[PDB]
Amino acid sequence: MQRSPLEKASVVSKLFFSWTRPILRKGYRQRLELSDIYQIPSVDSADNLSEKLEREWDRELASKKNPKLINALRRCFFWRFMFYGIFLYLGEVTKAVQPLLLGRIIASYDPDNKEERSIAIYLGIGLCLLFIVRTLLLHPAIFGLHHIGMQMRIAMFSLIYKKTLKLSSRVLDKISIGQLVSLLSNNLNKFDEGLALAHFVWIAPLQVALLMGLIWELLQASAFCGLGFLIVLALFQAGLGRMMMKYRDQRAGKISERLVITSEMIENIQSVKAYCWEEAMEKMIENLRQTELKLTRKAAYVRYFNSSAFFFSGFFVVFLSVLPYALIKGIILRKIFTTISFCIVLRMAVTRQFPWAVQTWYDSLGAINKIQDFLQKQEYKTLEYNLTTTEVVMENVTAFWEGTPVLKDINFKIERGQLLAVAGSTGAGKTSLLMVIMGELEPSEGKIKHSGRISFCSQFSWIMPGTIKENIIGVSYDEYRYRSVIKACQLEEDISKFAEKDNIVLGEGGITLSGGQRARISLARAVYKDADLYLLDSPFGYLDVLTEKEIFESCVCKLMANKTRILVTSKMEHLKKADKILILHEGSSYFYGTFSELQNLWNTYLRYITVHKSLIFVLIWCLVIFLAEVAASLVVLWLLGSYAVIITSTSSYYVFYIYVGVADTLLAMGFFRGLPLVHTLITVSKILHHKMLHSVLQAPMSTLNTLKAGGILNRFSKDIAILDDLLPLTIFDFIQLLLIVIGAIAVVAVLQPYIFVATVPVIVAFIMLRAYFLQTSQQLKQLESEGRSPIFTHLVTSLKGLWTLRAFGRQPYFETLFHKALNLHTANWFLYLSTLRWFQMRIEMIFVIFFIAVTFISILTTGEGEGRVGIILTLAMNIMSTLQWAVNSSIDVDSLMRSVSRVFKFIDMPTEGIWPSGGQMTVKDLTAKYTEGGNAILENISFSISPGQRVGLLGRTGSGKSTLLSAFLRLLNTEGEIQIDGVSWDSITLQQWRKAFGVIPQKVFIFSGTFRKNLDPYEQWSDQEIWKVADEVGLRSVIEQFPGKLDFVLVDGGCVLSHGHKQLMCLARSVLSKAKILLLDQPSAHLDPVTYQIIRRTLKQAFADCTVILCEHRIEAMLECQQFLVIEENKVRQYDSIQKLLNERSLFRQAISPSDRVKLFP
């Protein structure tokens, strides 16, 4: 990774962009490597840009009553922005005066024009210098504006992320992940290219004033008749832009709603497969796409008329201004052609450059104001303190999540070094109590007083990407402390069974880990940090009795006996070793005191075209009409082979020049062709999205584990939007230009078969340079597109762990990691944008030398009479002016076609592919492994389950209990044989095999949607049945506390619910499914013994029949099981009674609670 060559480039090298030569030569022959990409220039580093704009934005907040973000942007970039505007203007003025020189050179071919001939050579010298100046003025200026826009985007994106880490929890409900991704993705490439267009909001009016005075010289008052037509088009295009904005704004809300639902289902893909919810989720997303695709089409129709105004105005603007003059006095062909030359530039300013500039300001200012509102949102108030009385005291705190208070009149005092136990039922407010202490939930009444040093362990374990060792420690590294906590947390046994010991690369959310392993890593992280108060929100949920006992008596009670700590626990054996006990019920303190006190009381193009047959028929329809237009032109043109229009034998060559200047209107695609073309291009994107989503839900789990969350969102957000908005119009413009060039050459070749010969050297030169450039351009665009994924990945993980980020104070670390993602994307994007400027500058320089060669040859060969070489050659160069536009348009199409190839790559992902009456199942030689060629988790497992009995699956955390349950459903690589009721799993199809099971996953899955939709996504059960199940599982009181009884929309994964309420939701689904074989993966993870009775009574009433495989850790749930399966050292051991199982194991029964002990051994 070498230093940027721009740093030491010479002045001439900067001007011509010659410093890009090394990578253009390397990428042509062989593929680019990681070492070929240079570092970013220091000026556009994210760190420097963020500090610059932040320093100026703070001045507005302290100097003006109405702080504006645009004023801070002006103070940073205005003078460079306006500096490039004057050179862009001068290049366009050089363009406006070209017909003054070129028109006289063309007139010198007529022997009658003796005045033009006398100075023809001097006009050639001036014309050549005109071309050179224009080339050197435009391209450096346009690239300078591109660089300013890139720096503006980077600076604004850093401020957005820094604000995100400060947002208050009360506004987090209203800010979804889809909203933030939409804001970033929409401006990722659009914003940077916009600054090249912004200056035309004032350049174009000045061009119109200049050109109208030159047209006035020819046609005195008749000129204004053509201007009035352009004013009508200007008002028409202004109305089109306002309609397009209206449709786009209405569509924005549905796009954000789609992205959040798409992210949720792919994160929980394993639960989706186990439930067999692929069909329901596809139909759910399909209805969201349908509503937003209607607004896409209406916007696309309006944008057709906006982009067709240029081509259709070519004839009428000239005709309206030539006709009144010709009727009063005769007009010569020379004067007609000169009017056309000026009007070509005039039409470009009015109908192409100005409205695009106006729309750019609407887009940029719309995004700036949207970001400005985000930067002023409510901020998290950190009430940190330097010191205290070394104790924490709470005084009659009442809190609301907003009419029922979550907490009321809570008070307690905890002296230094004491342990407080928090008890209660499900939904009693035990988690909310800890949120208020942290300052994450502001109370409406009461006060809290303690020191600022707090350590926090969440009930929902969050794992940041990186190393296991990197998760436990912060940026500091104390080896003696690291070994201490790892031993006390019982992590040594699990670490020794890993390929990298403790240097394993964990994914986002720790997919590769077990449920209880994530709990231990979350607990070890909290105890490693030095603090005054320790908040532990039930870390013993997913742990067995033996591991729980060891950790409690060796880490909580031993390593931190002299530090204040609060423990949420439902075990009576933990209460006996706590200094004080608090019992919550409905948010009220049911009891406060001591224990004793309580005791007493290339191929992408072809595949894109042929995916929909309707597109092929529309293209043929366009082709047939085009042939008739060319044929009609031939007839009328060949037919031409005091009068209103004066023609002479020596002036007849102007006829072909006039045709070329108006060919863009005769060959324009009318609404009979433009509208159906754009309409059918949108149906292609509709089909591709359905195929892409379908294949993702069908891929094997091994493939999906390698995909990162931000790489999934990158394709479904950015690429899909490109196929909807940009590609249909970019293809239309390319097709229009190609037909114009093809038709113009075809018409003049048959009548004059030397123009076709003269244009071959120019055509081949353009094609050869295009082929050379595209070898490197396609690789850089691929690297830049893949550089957007790390930005989205970092955004997702920061929102999921926001509370843990603030608690441990690691905000500066995450801000630095976000700058790495920005700098990584900038390196590829800047390099891609630089080589593109080289190509577009060279394509114009190639045009210049051919025009210079033509100019001098034409003038010198023109003898005393006539001169035919100049007539032919100057016509050929007029045609090649349009091909230059077509070639540049072809590069834009190929840039967008990279998004098509990335979509097809996901579609090509491989697919993973009265019977249930008894429930008997036999297993033979089952071997389970997560990856092919990986280590096995289970080996040669064999057992049999008789029909109708219940089985207890036991074992230590991380032994492979969840692996065994996943092996039944073929969620991993299996090598055994399983026969349910006599049929082998190989014979019957996978889709039928999984439908025989009713599953309760260990990881609960709740998506953004109605209560009714979560319980029943296929809508196959009535409301009465749903309420009937809600009675059995105890969910009526939970539902009725919400405004909508089965109509309330759950958001953010159901954050409104408590942890134990999500368990009852998963129990409700299993009872409603009514499957013969049931696989329950610890259905009572955090329930207190009171709520566990709901599981116990459902186990014998709803599941009175059927074969039930329990996977519980609590000993009380083993009284109902006939058989027992014990996993240890990758092997299953079968028992027939619980007493014989515990007879052989001493340490296991030493950890059993005395209450359960007497129930097992009377």
Ligand SMILES: Cc1nn(C)cc1S(=O)(=O)NC(=O)c1ccc(-n2ccc(OCC(C)(C)C(F)(F)F)n2)nc1N1C[C@@H](C)CC1(C)C
């Ligand atoms: C080497 C190298 N390899 N690569 C990848 C980049 C580089 S380069 O940037 O160093 N040079 C070139 O790349 C380069 C520089 C100038 C030119 N010019 C074409 C006309 C022209 O006249 C200029 C003109 C008289 C109009 C005036 F001057 F008056 F304006 N000049 N062509 C260049 N090319 C080299 C090949 C890659 C293809 C080709 C022919 C287009």
Ligand SMILES: Cc1ccc(NC(=O)C2(c3ccc4c(c3)OC(F)(F)O4)CC2)nc1-c1cccc(C(=O)O)c1
């Ligand atoms: C009076 C004025 C002068 C210069 C600017 N712009 C700039 O200096 C820069 C810029 C910013 C956004 C852009 C843009 C260029 O080009 C775009 F891509 F189109 O978007 C170089 C930063 N802006 C204004 C202005 C407009 C509108 C409102 C206000 C206001 O104070 O309310 C101020």
Ligand SMILES: Nc1ncnc2c1ncn2[C@@H]1O[C@H](COP(=O)(O)OP(=O)(O)OP(=O)(O)O)[C@@H](O)[C@H]1O
């Ligand atoms: N996707 C995966 N890829 C690789 N290894 C995995 C994966 N999922 C789990 N493992 C590993 O396989 C082993 C067993 O997994 P685990 O779910 O299966 O056991 P468990 O008995 O269910 O644990 P717990 O009681 O904590 O839920 C562990 O070492 C775990 O780290």
Ligand SMILES: Nc1ncnc2c1ncn2[C@@H]1O[C@H](COP(=O)(O)OP(=O)(O)OP(=O)(O)O)[C@@H](O)[C@H]1O
């Ligand atoms: N973000 C929230 N917005 C609104 N209500 C909430 C929110 N979080 C929790 N609640 C509600 O507040 C009550 C208590 O929440 P909960 O976390 O706090 O208690 P808990 O004792 O920790 O329960 P559990 O044992 O299930 O973890 C419940 O009625 C729950 O539905």
Ligand SMILES: CC(C)CCC[C@@H](C)[C@H]1CC[C@H]2[C@@H]3CC=C4C[C@@H](O)CC[C@]4(C)[C@H]3CC[C@]12C
């Ligand atoms: C960029 C702008 C502000 C430059 C100046 C614009 C105006 C003042 C210029 C642009 C073109 C100019 C005209 C060009 C040609 C002629 C014909 C000549 O026989 C009389 C002057 C006259 C009619 C000029 C008058 C001034 C004019 C209309």
Ligand SMILES: CCCCCCCCCCCC
């Ligand atoms: C150089 C381009 C400046 C563009 C200024 C846009 C108009 C701003 C008007 C003031 C806000 C209402």
Ligand SMILES: [Mg+2]
């Ligand atoms: Mg809780």
Ligand SMILES: [Mg+2]
């Ligand atoms: Mg498990």
